[PDB]
Design a protein around this nucleic acid. Structure first.
Lengths: 117, 207, 63, 146
RNA sequence: GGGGCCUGACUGCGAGGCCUGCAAGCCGAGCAGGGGCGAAAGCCGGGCCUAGUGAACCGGUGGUCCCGUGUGGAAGGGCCA
RNA sequence: GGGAUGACCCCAGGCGGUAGGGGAGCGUUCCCGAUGCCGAUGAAGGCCGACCCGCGAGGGCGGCUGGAGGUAAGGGAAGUG
RNA sequence: GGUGGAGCCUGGGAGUGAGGGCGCGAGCGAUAACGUCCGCGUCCGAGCGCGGGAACAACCGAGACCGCCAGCUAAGGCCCC
RNA sequence: GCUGUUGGGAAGCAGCGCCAGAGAGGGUGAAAGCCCCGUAGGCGAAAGGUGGGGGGAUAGGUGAGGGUACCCGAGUACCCCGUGGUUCGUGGAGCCAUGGGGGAAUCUGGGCGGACCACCGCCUAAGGCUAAGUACUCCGGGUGACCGAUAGCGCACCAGUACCGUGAGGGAAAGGUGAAAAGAACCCCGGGAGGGGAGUGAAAUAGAGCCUGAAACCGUGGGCUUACAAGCAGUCACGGCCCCAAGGGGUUGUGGCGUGCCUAUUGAAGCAUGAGCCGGCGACUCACGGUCGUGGGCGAGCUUAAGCCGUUGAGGCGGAGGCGUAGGGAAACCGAGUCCGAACAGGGCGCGUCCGCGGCCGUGGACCCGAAACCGGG
RNA sequence: CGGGGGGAACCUGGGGAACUGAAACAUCUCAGUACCCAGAGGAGAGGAAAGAGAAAUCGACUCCCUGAGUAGCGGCGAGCG
């Protein structure tokens, strides 16, 4: 018996055209400009997740530095402090203490330079 | 052995009990039964599907355009399988799906098929057929007395052509001469009913 | 549609009961003139190895 | 028995190998990568190089056949008295064809392995050995044929 | 290098290895036949060693337990060289 | 390794990848299953879906269209992506 | 010593038979070439996936099953980008 | 086979029946054994075809010895030369046929049995006819794990047409309203074409190349958004505005990152190949052998082919034959051995089948498309 | 009296290629195939032994299965059979 393509192709194609919503021009309309685009989109996302995880390490650091620069010392030194003090805690994420509750930050700094006389 | 088939009231004489060998629950081999049904339905296949190679298509062999400085793509004749008009590639030809299954494996299957059916409690071989002059009416009445209500499907084998005409048109009964005994027809049916003369030939067909 | 035996081998190599392929030593049909008695003597049959798998496949009906 | 799952047991496998997709046997088709995997190639078995196969080996298997073909000559079939042990009474050709050995293969010759048996045994010949073992009761119907 | 007798520049075999894609190439102790030299122990299956070579096919010679198209022989094959 | 084998849980390794080799699936046409079952209270196909299950191939479910066909489990065949 | 995606044996299926750079050792070349020919090693090939080197197959770091808005390091970096 | 029930429409659903040698299949407003056409089963030819199948009737055929030796197919046999056919390619080359030369006999005749001789045997050449069992499918019919309008024939349709070519020749495209035409009177704008009302219809985004109506492509409206930024067009993050709600959806301002896809290559974003885009068509197969593997059946055995009978989606029978049960040797041969050899040296070789499935191979295009060309007949 | 011309295949006879395969090519192969001509008919051909071939053998011809990829043929190549 004969098994013509039938319905099947139209569907692989509009599965993929759904994924292509909002791409510029033909990238959202062509069965296969969409396709191409989406490989690259896919890789971008994957690596870009990796990066997001480094992109924030970075952000935190820079406002940590900022704030502890406000009390004389700097980030190189400040981390030494926390390290020795045993408070591997901060976790650059959570030195948003820099902003909400600097009170608390102030202390942390003090404890930090105390490990260093 | 577990082997006690079910006599059926020739005249008023109630239901005795015939009993016979590994012809009764021996040990069913599904795979084999399968191989037999498989064989049965392939040999019955027709294989009349055909299609035209590029060679068999009406179009001529003229070369369609130069090959060279056209600016179009290369091509011979318009009968090629990249061409809409053209031939189909490895499309079906007519062929024969039959093959010769080991006779012995057929005996086995046939023997077993009944056995499963005997074990189930479905095999009932009979004698009484006052349901004569093959009228559906007559058979049906007779069936009622034999507890054949038409609530399961039934395979009736017998050499008596009048009882054959009798069922047939019933849609829950599959009618059959004994030489036509075969696993598929056995299996497809829920219940098995045999003439004792039919059970005699079935005997011979094994051993 | 049915393989033919390759007569050129049938004609020059036996198949043993293991299913090893046996051929005469080449190399003494006119060479000679004076090669050692050892040379000319040392031609009875022999095995082959990996190249017999090939030679067997061609003696297909005779097994 | 039921209708479904009479179903093939264990391993039937009719899942043969197709080569067309992104995953499995792709692009160039499940093998091939090159040129002369393309719609024919020379053998091998025998062929190739354009070297000399090994048709440098040589047909000492001389006595290969003359024009009008074979010579009809009466052909002989071996059977061990070992094999005879089975059955008793008297053994003869054709009586044997209706069993494992001889069949049509013409002129019977009993020989060889196993202990002999008390029965007269018609044959076209024996090995010396088998003639001796068959002293333990049994025949010298030999001669035969006309 | 020189002399004496010699023809093992043997026939039938080859444990076992080198080399090695194949097929080739190479070394080989030892046993039998019938020899050579030596009193003997032994040595001899060409040459101090590593080049001087050419698979099969197709033919030619000389042999020969073989085959011989109804039988006997031929014709023509095979086998050894 | 357990072993109330539970294909269910602990223990330890591994899991870039072209030619290739192997292993498990998905889906299309047709066959048995079928004198059956779903269908006008709406089949096939189509247009949406931010919902559900699947690693994925896919499978559902919901709305809209459509207007008459479709076809389980479990098997079988191929003009099968 | 060494249980390793080690080894050995028998069989089915292959692809390859076009390499490239770097380091070291030679030849050719002019102690020229992103030259050319071998040898040992390594990577790219197939790791144009990740970090360094401004950018950059094969130099340095390092072998990417998936996820994290956690942590420690590698090369290389800490005046601003 | 009626009623009832939803529905435009019952054949659905329900109640209660019936026929069945008929429960194949199509149609009827949807899905019906019992409405229609049918099916099972059974009838039928005045006419013209066909017709030993069953009869008849002819033609035709129906002896022994014992003698004569009168006849038993001529440019024939036979031989040589040159060739063909056969498995036979000059081979040791017969047999069958015959272009050329030479050229018999009538059973003591003559051909043959693979050069040739001799035995032994086979057959009667140079005249002719002969059914059946076999092939094929213009045509009628029956079936389908055959196609379903880019498929199936080139042609579902007024196609061997339109069209192309002097000609031979080449050769398309193009199916579908609806149950019923009930195919839209009449009014309105317009020259008409087209609309808008009205109207039919269950439905008119079923309105006439009218079922379904995907994508490319072109519009209209609406949301978010952009005129000091640099780009494989995406992505990760924040923030703004827009739409139903502690959750989403849309959009994108700034920030970080980022060398298209395929092919071919040592190496491609590559300024190397292919590709306007969308849809459909488009490439690893089948037969028979083989060889591995695997699911089974039986086992020193296994298995049947063609056919014959039975079925009418039924299976049986049929052992001719085939592999295996024994090997060695070129062979004669011998045999658990045998070959070389003088050899009680040595050494060489010397322990299943059937069916299914899958990998691979040989023969056929054998994964698909493409030559420049060669040949025959026009 | 007959003939003539037509007919999808199928048949017999008279003539009769090449690409191709042989991994070049001439013998060989494709193949007495394709094609041309003549003829036959529902079929055609063949057909009652101057046969086979080793069997005290069989007994017209045709067709199927075997025999058998055997016997052999063969630049003993490809392959034919």
């Amino acid at each position: 018996p004969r098994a013509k393509t039938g319905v099947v192709r139209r569907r692989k194609h509009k599965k993929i055209l759904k994924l292509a919503k909002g791409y510029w021009g033909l990238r959202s309309k062509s069965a296969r400009k969409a396709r191409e685009t989406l490989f690259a989109a896919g890789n971008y996302a994957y690596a870009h997740r990796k990066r997001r995880k480094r992109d924030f390490r970075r952000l935190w650091i820079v406002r940590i530095n900022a704030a502890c620069r406000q009390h004389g010392l700097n980030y190189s030194t400040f981390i030494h402090g926390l390290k020795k003090a045993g408070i591997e805690v901060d976790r650059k994420n959570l030195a948003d203490l820099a902003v909400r509750e600097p009170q608390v930050f102030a202390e942390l700094v003090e404890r930090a330079k105390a490990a260093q006389g | 052995m577990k082997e006690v088939a079910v006599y059926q009231i020739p005249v008023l004489s109630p239901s005795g009990r015939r009993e016979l060998a590994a012809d009764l629950p021996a040990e069913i081999n599904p795979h084999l039964l399968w191989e037999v049904v498989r064989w049965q339905l392939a040999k019955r296949r027709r294989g009349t599907a055909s299609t035209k190679t590029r060679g068999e298509v009406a179009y001529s062999g003229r070369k369609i355009w130069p090959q060279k400085h056209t600016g179009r793509a290369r091509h011979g004749d318009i009968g090629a399988p990249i061409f809409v008009g053209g031939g189909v590639v490895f499309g079906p030809k007519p062929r024969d799906y039959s093959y010769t299954l080991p006779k012995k494996v057929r005996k086995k299957g046939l023997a077993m098929a009944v056995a499963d059916r005997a074990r189930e409690g479905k095999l009932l071989l009979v004698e009484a057929f006052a349901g004569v002059n093959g009228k559906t009416k007559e058979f049906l009445a007779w069936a009622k007395e034999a507890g054949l209500d038409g609530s399961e499907s039934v395979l009736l084998v017998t050499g008596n052509e009048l009882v054959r005409r009798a069922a047939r048109n019933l849609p829950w009964v599959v009618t059959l001469a004994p030489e036509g005994l075969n696993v598929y027809d056995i299996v497809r049916t829920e219940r098995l009913v045999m003439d004792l003369d039919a059970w005699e030939v079935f005997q011979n067909r094994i051993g | 549609p049915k393989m033919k035996t390759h007569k050129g081998a049938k004609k020059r190599v036996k198949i043993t009961a293991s299913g090893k392929v046996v051929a005469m030593k080449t190399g003494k049909r006119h060479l000679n003139w004076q090669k050692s008695g050892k040379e000319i003597r040392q031609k009875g049959r022999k095995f082959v190895l990996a190249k017999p798998e090939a030679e067997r496949i061609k003696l297909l009906l005779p097994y | 028995d039921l209708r479904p799952n009479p179903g093939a047991n264990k391993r039937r496998k009719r899942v043969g190998r197709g080569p067309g997709s992104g995953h499995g046997k792709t692009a160039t088709r499940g093998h091939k990568g090159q040129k002369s995997r393309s719609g024919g190639l020379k053998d091998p078995r025998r062929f190739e190089g354009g070297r000399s196969t090994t048709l440098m080996r040589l047909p000492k298997r001389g006595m290969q056949g003359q024009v009008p073909g074979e010579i009809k000559r009466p052909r002989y079939q071996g059977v061990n008295l070992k094999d005879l042990a089975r059955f008793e009474g008297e053994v003869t050709p054709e009586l044997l064809v209706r069993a494992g050995l001889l069949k049509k293969g013409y002129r019977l010759k009993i020989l060889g392995e196993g202990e002999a048996k008390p029965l007269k045994v018609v044959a076209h010949a024996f090995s010396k050995s088998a003639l001796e073992k068959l002293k333990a009761a049994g025949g010298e119907p030999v001669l035969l044929e006309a």
